[PDB]
Ligand binder design. Structure first.
Ligand code: CD4
Ligand SMILES: *[C@@H]1O[C@H](CO)[C@@H](O[C@@H]2O[C@H](CO)[C@@H](O)[C@H](O)[C@H]2NC(C)=O)[C@H](O)[C@H]1NC(C)=O
Ligand code: PLM
Ligand code: NAG
Lengths: 98, 265
């Protein structure tokens, strides 16, 4: 069993008030079964698109989740991952300072 | 210069549940997907057929359709004779050169165990010993061995050649990077971050600079994919408070026509 790594980054330079795209890239996990939610203020975002599951030279799986968002001075964005290698869902919050 | 990879992922949960999904990549550009619940292979590019005729494509896909159903039945029967859940992955394809080398690697429970090599299947150093029997019996399957050899020796390089011609304009697209700056505290001392996003192709140059002096301490992170087939990358630099003043991030990329991005902190 391999533990998922989560990296959350935006497509464009984040600018408060400006429609952007938030990427959640989950890598290094195994087996391939996984659950990925992207969150705004701790709530499930509905229209999250995902890439097809793929894997690397080391056989470990990866996938890209992404959704439309607007960075603001008050909203938190997060990527939460549920995977058999962890007893608890892991959440990583987007931080533009990165 | 180019790696073409077919990636098969097969999960076997119990006697009655399994699925197989595959994706195909030419460099960093997905060209196919084959969902378990799809009878047929899906093109993820306008040019994913390459130079193959419709007839050659149909034939080739039929062959894969037979292999998909066959493979499922073979593993399921194999476990019924000779411990769940089962994850099997296959990575086959070829590496092209300017004037190729083909591969078929198999992993089991995420451990590389078997390969095709020349004319037969081999178990790989420190694979499970029980794998030798089914692999020998499989080496007795002349028809499969012949098809596999053709696929790898002939079909792959030839098909990829067509792809390369057919996807010229996608493979050689230039998308310009956009860059921005941030910094981050430490337990002690700050860390400068240069965000570079939206560039294609992958190769890129990113350095923290003080005037014309390279800050060799520049640490390049992993290339993270965007959802539009462009790349994201940070280049970072530890600094002391005070030290930021005068530093700049410089990005060079083939898309920029020699006009480097320079961003001064
Ligand atoms: C990524 C994708 C890369 C791989 C693609 C390879 C595709 C092979 C093409 C040939 C084909 O369709 O196979 C038909 C065959 C059915 O056999 P058959 O030929 O009908 O056997 C009966 C008999 O007629 C044989 O003689 P014939 O001349 O007719 O052939 O079924 C199979 O062989 C499927 C198995 C082949 C791959 C086995 C990989 C072994 C990995 C083992 C991992 C460990 C698991 C626990
Ligand atoms: C596919 O290519 C492989 C090499 O990758 C061929 O296998 C070799 O064939 C030569 C020439 O007959 C033999 O001397 C070698 O012993 C074989 N190599 C290995 C590693 O076993 C294979 O014959 C080719 N098959 C087809 C159908 O073209
Ligand atoms: C089999 C090794 C090399 C493969 C050469 C195949 C030539 C065309 C590839 C088209 C993509 C087919 C994807 C099937 C992969 C799978 O589902 O296992
Ligand atoms: C995968 O495909 C076959 C036929 O489409 C089906 O019988 C099987 O149940 C599928 N697996 C899943 C998990 O649906």
């Amino acid at each position: 069993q391999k533990t998922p790594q989560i990296q959350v980054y935006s497509r464009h330079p984040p600018e408060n008030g400006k429609p952007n795209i938030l990427n959640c890239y989950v890598t290094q996990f195994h087996p391939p079964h996984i659950e990925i939610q992207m969150l705004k203020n701790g709530k499930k975002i509905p229209k999250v698109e995902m890439s097809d599951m793929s894997f690397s030279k080391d056989w470990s799986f990866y996938i890209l989740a992404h959704t439309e968002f607007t960075p603001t001075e008050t909203d938190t964005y997060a990527c939460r991952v549920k995977h058999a290698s962890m007893a608890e869902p892991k959440t990583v919050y987007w931080d533009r300072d990165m | 210069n180019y790696t073409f990879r077919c990636l098969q992922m097969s999960s076997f949960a119990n006697r009655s549940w399994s699925r197989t999904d595959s994706v195909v990549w030419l460099g960093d550009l997905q060209t196919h997907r084959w969902s378990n619940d799809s009878a047929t292979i899906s093109f993820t590019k306008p040019w994913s057929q390459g130079k193959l005729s419709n007839q050659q494509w149909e034939k080739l896909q039929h062959m894969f359709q037979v292999y998909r159903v066959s493979f499922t039945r073979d593993i399921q029967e194999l476990v019924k004779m000779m411990d769940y859940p089962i994850e099997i992955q296959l990575s086959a394809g070829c590496e092209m050169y300017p004037g190729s080398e083909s591969f078929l690697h198999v992993a089991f429970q995420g451990k590389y165990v078997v390969r095709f090599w020349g004319t037969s299947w081999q178990t790989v150093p420190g694979a499970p010993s029980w794998l030798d029997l089914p692999i020998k019996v499989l080496n007795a399957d002349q028809g499969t061995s012949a098809t596999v050899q053709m696929l790898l020796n002939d079909t792959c390089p030839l098909f990829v050649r067509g792809l390369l011609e057919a996807g010229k304009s996608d493979l050689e697209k230039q998308e310009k990077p956009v860059a921005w700056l941030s910094s981050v505290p430490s337990s002690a001392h700050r860390q400068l971050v240069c965000h570079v996003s939206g560039f294609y192709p992958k190769p890129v140059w990113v350095m923290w600079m003080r005037g014309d002096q390279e800050q060799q301490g520049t640490h390049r992170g992993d290339f993270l994919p965007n959802a539009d087939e462009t790349w994201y990358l940070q280049a970072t630099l530890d600094v002391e408070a005070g030290e930021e003043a005068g530093l700049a991030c410089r990005v060079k990329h083939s898309s920029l026509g020699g006009q480097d991005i320079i961003l001064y902190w």
